[PDB]
Amino acid sequence: RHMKKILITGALGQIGSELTIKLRNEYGEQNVIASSRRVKEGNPVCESGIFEILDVTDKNRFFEIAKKYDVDTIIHLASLLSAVAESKPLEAWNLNMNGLINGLEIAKELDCKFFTPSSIAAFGENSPKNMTPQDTLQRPNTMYGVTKVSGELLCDYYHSKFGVDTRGVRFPGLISYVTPPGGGTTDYAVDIYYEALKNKRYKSYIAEGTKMDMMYMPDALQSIVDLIEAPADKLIHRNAFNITAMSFSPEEIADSIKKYIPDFVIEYDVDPVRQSIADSWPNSLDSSSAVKEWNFKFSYDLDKMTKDMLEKLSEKGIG
């Protein structure tokens, strides 16, 4: 029921960067195998513990690395996300789907726990926009979204048909202090804290009053563990559970920011392509199934986050 030996694919992405460190501290530097397509100069991960080059689209090599460390858990983060997927759609289909089916076939063969993250991106324009149910209409118009729905279906098939322990969460916008603003769809809520301690002024690429689910990275990382290790028998859903901690418009963060940096200002430009995608997406999701089935918890509201972000961005040296 608990993880001993863990393989993370996509370990140098936003989530992997901070997850591999957490699980190292909690499960042992020698029991967490971080893996990626390519090294990144001075990522913390790469210079501290066990690390293995892995292209998840090679079943053979993926299987080699599972067997080499006798893993009981695979946290399959490898994928192309929103921005990159739209530009490179066939590359996103190949990585996101051949990577996944490879991992599932490995987990089928080895009796692994298999965690795949999904996204708000797995919801369409007609998906209900307010307390979006767990089970509902999933017709997204992005290639990333299509891969996440295709994957939810496939991960549930490996459980229903072969008994593989597959599970996952639909992450909203994540906010972290370790990973720098990457001009992605939801990254407005990270860059705002940078431009607050750096100038006293932020230029939003996202229209005022536009509401979105968000979660602070520590909340999200705990989701992954709480769910991987949850008792099997109370799981009605598996791939994947809505989770959320907050919804907010750019103007609501500002008000949380200014409660600690009173001179703070919010201008509004409007990238119409990212607004488009934010408008695709629900305003708020219903975590109930998550709460009922494995006791999804969380610690940071918009205030608690805002305080901790401005501490952790000063310690790192921005002001």
**Active-site amino acid positions:** 144
Comparison of 162 and 198: residue with beta carbon closer to a second copy:
162
Q: Identify the residue among 46, 50, 83, 154 touching a second copy (CB under 8 A).
A: 154
Listed ranges 68-76, 90-98, 225-233, 307-315: which one lies at the site for a second copy (CB under 8 A) = 90-98
Note the residue count of the chain.
Answer: 319
Comparison of 13 and 145: residue with beta carbon closer to a second copy:
145
Comparison of 142 and 247: residue with beta carbon closer to a second copy:
142
Residue 157 engages a second copy in binding (rule: CB under 8 A): yes
Q: Identify the residue among 131, 153, 178, 273 touching a second copy (CB under 8 A).
A: 153
Residue numbers followed by a gap, the chain, C–N over 2.5 Å: none
* C-alpha span between 133 and 148 (Å, rounded): 17
Q: How many C-alpha atoms does 55 have within 13 Å on its Cβ side?
A: 5
Q: Which phi and psi angles does 285 have, rounded to 5°?
A: -110, 165
Residues of this chain, 114-143, that bind a second copy according to CB under 8 A: 126, 135-143
Q: Identify the residue among 42, 60, 161, 319 touching a second copy (CB under 8 A).
A: 161
Comparison of 23 and 85: residue with beta carbon closer to a second copy:
85
| Residue ranges in contact with a second copy by CB under 8 A | 89-90, 93, 97, 101, 105, 126, 135-143, 145-146, 149-150, 153-154, 156-157, 160-161
